[PDB]
């Protein structure tokens, strides 16, 4: 591989340079129109996510099917952690797009969405309370990509994961934290991935029910990623 020979700073730069762009939503919210905007936005972000995954160091060294497996398992977690990251500077609000900033009251016009909104908002404030930095954020999102499906070539994925752990510790030591604060913060960040996994599972069920609603037109790509969870 190539990711194992990179330094911690080169790993950070590789992840920052790979970041996907911020997309805009299509410019009186009904359940159909609200779900339409959110699923239209999520579908367009999935295209940029796939090309972002290619640029995550170590991801190209995997077979095509292993790449498919990891993305099929983690795509909703990756969308969610990205949403909560750009919502950090907007307390009590979710920044789906620069022109689409929503609160939990607006999440009420779609049945069942409030619970997911509250969980997303809880994650964003947790990131805000911890003062999560962008260099730490890109490490966590990469960890989700490689870890979420790894329990379902595996030695290489675990070696890249260890490399990202080294990079995370490198950032915290560079920020002036003691050895104790380093492993405490590492643990605090990784435990949030358990909640993010929880939110994703709740989000899959919500999207599956809206599929059988026939409420919202879901793109074929979004339907295929949803069908990966049987």
């Amino acid at each position: 591989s190539l990711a194992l020979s990179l330094t911690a700073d080169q790993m950070v730069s590789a992840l920052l340079d790979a970041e996907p762009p911020i997309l805009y939503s299509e410019y009186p919210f009904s359940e159909a129109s609200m779900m339409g905007l959110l699923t239209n936005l999520a579908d367009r972000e999935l295209v940029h996510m796939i090309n972002w995954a290619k640029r995550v160091p170590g991801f190209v060294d995997l077979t095509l099917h292993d790449q498919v497996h990891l993305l099929e398992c983690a795509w909703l977690e990756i969308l969610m952690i990205g949403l909560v990251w750009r919502s950090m500077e907007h307390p009590g609000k979710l920044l789906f797009a620069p022109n689409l900033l929503l609160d939990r009251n607006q999440g009420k016009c779609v049945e069942g969405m409030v619970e997911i909104f509250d969980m997303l908002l809880a994650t964003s404030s947790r990131f805000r309370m911890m003062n999560l930095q962008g260099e730490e954020f890109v490490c966590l999102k990469s960890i989700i990509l490689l870890n979420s499906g790894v329990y379902t070539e595996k030695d290489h994925i675990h070696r890249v994961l260890d490399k990202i752990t080294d990079t995370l510790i490198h950032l915290m030591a560079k920020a002036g934290l003691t050895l104790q604060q380093q492993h405490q913060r590492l643990a605090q960040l990784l435990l949030i991935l358990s909640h993010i996994r929880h939110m994703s599972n709740k989000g899959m069920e919500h999207l599956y029910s809206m599929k059988c609603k026939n409420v919202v037109p879901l793109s074929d790509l979004l339907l295929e990623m949803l069908d990966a969870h049987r």
């Binding site: 090309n51 095509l64 790509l221």
Partner: peptide, 10 residues
């Protein structure tokens, strides 16, 4: 035959 396949290859 999945959309994800061709998006990863291109």
């Amino acid at each position: 035959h999945k959309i994800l396949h061709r998006l990863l290859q291109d």
